[PDB]
Design a protein around this ligand. Structure first.
Ligand SMILES: [Zn+2]
Ligand SMILES: [Zn+2]
Lengths: 158, 94, 65, 101, 65, 160
């Protein structure tokens, strides 16, 4: 279907604009793998980064990324829970807000859209967890099956 | 009293103007920032100019503070303090 | 980024207003602002730099009934 | 003699105009310029007004707007009790009217 | 169509105010509104139905300083 | 052959189909194949394009009721190019959007099809139709090529 093709190609451009890697496009769009490369080469100057999908949980418990990931996810959680928008749409709308918050702090974007999309799929597969902080009360990311009652967020006690 | 009611009436209107602008621009994104339900946000987009003015000069602070924990607030205002506040407010209910 | 400025300015207006209210009459401000004594004490003792760095958020710092 | 209730209506009208002007410019700049008969430069100013800026300009106690019809001969024929295209008719004239820079 | 509804409402709001101003004090309203006498006379003598039919357009009926 | 270039053209093509553009208007303003548009039109609207040929006649645009709508529509189009700093088919569309907007109030049927609106623009672009200023009201309406002014009165100031 031509309409079916038009929306998918349009979505691909949105993801390329957000810095999505090649594989992320292949997952959420029906476009051919080679077509994405030509599209990626047309939008951005160079060809796709040729790096493979990250999929590792050691990163998301690191001191600085845990902060950005726990912030991004708390925005994502609102999009699905009360925003009544799910799917790749929920992932993007949360990332847009995450980037928005970067402007104030002025720091560099620590969570790439690909890692952000990876984090969401990790939760969808129950490989990463949300633990509520005993001190502050905000819910951050932790390893699967990590114990509570001794949890303190990275911000309350670095 | 007296002059204070001008500042109260001015602030009440200024909040309402931001709420409509946010909801009109994007409903879901607005609900996130204002921490407000879909029903209320939908109401704000449909509010007319005169309806806003009436609520503005109510002589009461129509908006309420979103922080109720002094222990968290005091530690919050002492370099990631800005980031930390967002994570707390995001989980707060509508 | 213009949206951030409207959010920061409304936040600062609320904090400036709440601070001016608490400083004049704490017992009386707690009524109109719907705030505890412990929070009102913090609001009064905030510097302008604190109020700005607090108000510089992408979220509105006050909700609504 | 104007004060008291009259001044309330003036300030309310000023706000409603500015709220509509920003709502028009925000949705579409060019379409807004057409309705308000106003230059691209001004539309940028109206959209860029913040909430606090609106409060100050709104309650100026002065009639911020000026009428867009200045030919009494035209107005009488435009609003006359006969073809009823008077609504369409007014649009053609106001469209050619120049903007404000 | 909500954009049209607000446009129709604002036009009528202006016409009603200009009409009250001219009717109460023409010599001063012409000054305040920046309008000629002949136009001021037309505004005063407009019926309620005329004001609606005049205001029911897709264009804003007043400009700005 | 640019993939982005194709995305924009298909994007423009759907817009015109939504406004009721005929097949020919699509072929003119997009680089898409004639056959691809038919599948697109069949996907958008239930049935295939009307297969009717482009009107290209000036008699329609001088009838009193169409003249009103066209002289009104053009005044928006004229503003889009002159002061809106937007030209081309984009300018034609934005004017039609306002024309449709104004139609809702009167409640009458849309008398100017988007193709006739697009036909009018090519007529003026080709200097086959002209704008005469009304002696009474001062509004500028459309008239036949090389018809004299200084004796003109618009359809609204003096109907038949
Ligand atoms: Zn904590
Ligand atoms: Zn005429």
């Amino acid at each position: 279907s031509v309409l079916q093709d038009a929306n998918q190609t349009q979505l691909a451009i949105e993801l390329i604009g957000l810095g999505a890697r090649l594989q992320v496009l292949e997952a959420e769009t029906t476009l051919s793998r080679d077509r994405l490369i030509r599209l990626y080469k047309e939008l951005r100057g160079v060809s796709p980064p040729k790096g493979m999908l990250p999929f590792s949980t050691d990163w998301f418990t690191t001191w600085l990324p845990n902060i950005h990931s726990s912030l991004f996810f708390s925005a994502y959680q609102f999009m699905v829970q009360e925003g009544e928008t799910v799917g790749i749409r929920a992932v993007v709308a949360a990332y847009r807000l995450y980037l928005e918050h970067v402007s104030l702090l002025g720091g560099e974007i620590v969570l790439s859209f690909t890692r952000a999309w990876t984090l969401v799929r990790f939760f969808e597969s129950n490989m990463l967890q949300l633990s509520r902080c005993t001190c502050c009360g905000g819910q951050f990311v932790t390893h699967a099956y990590e114990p509570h009652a001794n949890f303190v967020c990275s911000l309350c006690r670095p | 009293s007296s002059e204070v009611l001008q500042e109260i009436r001015e602030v009440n209107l200024a909040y309402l103007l931001l709420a409509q602008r946010l909801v009109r621009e994007n409903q879901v994104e607005a609900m996130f920032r204002l921490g407000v339900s879909k029903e209320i946000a939908d109401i704000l987009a449909k509010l007319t100019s005169a309806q806003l003015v009436k609520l503005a000069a109510s002589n009461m602070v129509l908006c309420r503070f979103r922080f109720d924990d002094h222990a968290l607030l005091s530690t919050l205002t002492h370099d990631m303090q800005q980031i930390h506040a967002a994570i707390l407010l995001a989980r707060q209910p509508v």
